[PDB]
Symmetry: C5
Subunit: 102 residues, 5 copies
């Protein structure tokens, strides 16, 4: 139906992060070079994001699911909604929503 | 619909049974106040996925996550045992139904 | 149906061979009375997947779960070695069959 | 790859294991019964192999990938090439190559 | 082609960019001389996938393995940042391109 769930929006708006709706991810990147170490995605229009990571339970779970959502979007063409931080370049994903429809 | 087995299992607890749910969104959030894994149905119902750190529930909760994603990716229906006290309601058990099975 | 190897392995045990099974439900449940992973076949039969915390059976039981979901998602048939000592019967071994690979 | 990559063949041929090429895996088996405890694969010809396992890094990674390769071959009917030891029965897979058709 | 982000990241290292690679083979090997994970391209190129025991690179290396498999399985193409200091060349970064998203 397009558009993040109201739940997802409400959650994002109570933070400093920015809602990004209806993104098509077309690249998934793994990098271990010491300066650019991380997991990233790139959208059809060139937007770049870094995926959050955590070693500890329970965020080690959510961040692993963020990766699975990112890769499934890339393989499937499914769109995502993102709650993303403007602190850095690239912006960091703090929440992500995979949509069958909206 | 849900297997009798899954219905009976839910009925032993304080939770309620939700049947034939079509999940359309799968959310991962690490924001400090909404930290969790969540799903949203085609009608806007929201649920949190149980989590657990230690054996053996770490297995069961991982499988709930896999079931939820599969549901969203394929449009397969699920049946849920969910606590009504919490909002969003917590999934205590979940049943994935194969495409073209019973409902 | 079942490889001769799988059959022969099952026949070495007190367990029962179940051949040609279409799994149509996959259940994850963390309620404490019915804690576990289960599958339901198109005939309505219910089985519990084995679990193990330690190496190496933690590998095999992980793989049983992957076989179970793969079967539910795809309609591929499984053969099971299941113990009738409890209900639901516990899967001690499982074999996933490629589509159009015999019976 | 109308066959195993020259790399995979060269690597196998320096060991005591033997090369099995172009195999169609039709069954994937998980077993925790006391004397047949293991992961196995069965080919369209009735050949049975045991997948290696390892508890420690780095071979926990390689054996985990062996299992992914084996299931993916069974689901997809993509063929595999195996480097397998005859020191046991079933023969133990020491290396495996998933190959796209062609 | 690779994203500009990916290219700029590769240009700050000693490695070289390889663009638009079709991976046709995925190898897991525990033989004592050639122990590793490798991929092979449609042209016969061989690369070794990086690995790492500990956080955070155990995440990134696990994802390289997932990207590799998904490429071979589905024929989606990859861009790679590969060091020529070893033989086979080692992958230090990899970019998975969506089907129908062009070069």
């Amino acid at each position: 139906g397009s558009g993040a769930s109201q739940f997802f929006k409400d959650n994002c708006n109570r933070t400093t992060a920015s809602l990004v709706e209806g993104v098509e991810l077309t690249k998934y990147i793994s990098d271990i070079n010491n300066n650019t170490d991380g997991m990233y995605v790139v959208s059809s229009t060139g937007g770049v994001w870094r995926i959050s990571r955590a070693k500890d339970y329970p965020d080690n779970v959510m961040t692993a699911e963020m990766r699975k959502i990112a890769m499934a979007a890339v393989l499937s063409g499914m769109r995502v909604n993102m709650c993303a931080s403007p602190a850095s370049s690239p912006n960091v994903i703090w929440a992500i929503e995979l949509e069958a429809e909206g």
